[model samples]
Target: SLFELGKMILQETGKNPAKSYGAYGCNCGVLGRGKPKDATDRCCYVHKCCYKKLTGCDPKKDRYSYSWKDKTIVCGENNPCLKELCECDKAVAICLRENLGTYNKKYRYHLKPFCKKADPC
Candidate 1:
């Protein structure tokens, strides 16, 4: 069925869907423009530091309920990390045509492209 759809993309754009610029760009360094995977992983040392610098809250060991007197701030509207997830998750959808693209067109929304070298976090 992919061949059936591929024809449509080529017919409309005069380009192969498999040879899209986005495919290579995503696989190459465009999407991975920022630091390495570990650097992005919060569990990593540098990543933790980056997160701390951005969120201003240490990840509490408390995976359970929060306490009023605890030194660590729990996940709430006040916490930047929690709030970022809340806002970012809703920033866009993967299923939407504008976000995913159509059979006759190839387009990526380029979410989290690391365009800002200075992490906004």
Candidate 2:
């Protein structure tokens, strides 16, 4: 079997899936506390959600979704599974540039790495 298909939860009638504790990023840290490590890292963060939320792609595939970047993605024809995964990645790459306007400005900080500095918050 390939990527497992999940239920399509529409935003209007669907519950907000933000509660899921899946990994978003590092360095910049999760939550509203700080910005992401780099502009590139957050791209996959959105890409993971893009697969699950908008496209109904399986969460199993979400694990190491960013690892997909390690290889060249030559997609198959008309295969819906590969289609959404590929499509969502495209969407998130769009988001990376867009994040420069929103997220980049939104999560920017006056300081450097917080973890190396050490804090439980």
Candidate 3:
């Protein structure tokens, strides 16, 4: 089932139990929106890609965190990306098992181009 698959995927991506797999934008914004022009803004997923949008940061920048990134700790509403997240690295494997050249055609196109080649929640 999709739900079951999602649950598994989230667990693997460190999104389960609500733990943040922290990252650094290097204070350069190179990892974020792509340019220092966009550096003054800080964006984060309040819950699975639900970005707060580009906003001025606190002090030099604002640091953000959320509860759903934890796997051992569950919180907040049901994540909309649960299904897609679950298929992360498994999408291609699942597709292959089904004899499909790529993702499940029904939902493959919806997956981001980055996600299609390699699954990541």
Quick one: best TM-score, which candidate?
Answer: 2
Question: What is the C-alpha lDDT profile of model 1 across 1-121, one tens digit per residue?
Answer: 2332333334434554455523322221132333322211211223223334434433332122222234322324545554543222212111111222332222222234643343433
Pitting candidate 1 against candidate 3, the one with the higher TM-score is: 1
lDDT of 3 by residue, 49-78 (tens): 222222232211322222434443232232
**Number of the top candidate by lDDT?**
2
> What tens-digit string does per-residue lDDT give for candidate 2 at 4-48?
111111111132222211233343223332344555345544554
State in Å the error of residue 69, model 3.
8.4
Clashes of 1: 0
Off by over 4 Å in 3: 1-52, 58-61, 68-121
RMSD to the true structure for each prediction, in A, is 15.8, 13.3, 14.7
**Model 2 Cα shift for residue 86 (angstroms):** 1.2
TM-score of every prediction relative to native: 0.24, 0.32, 0.17
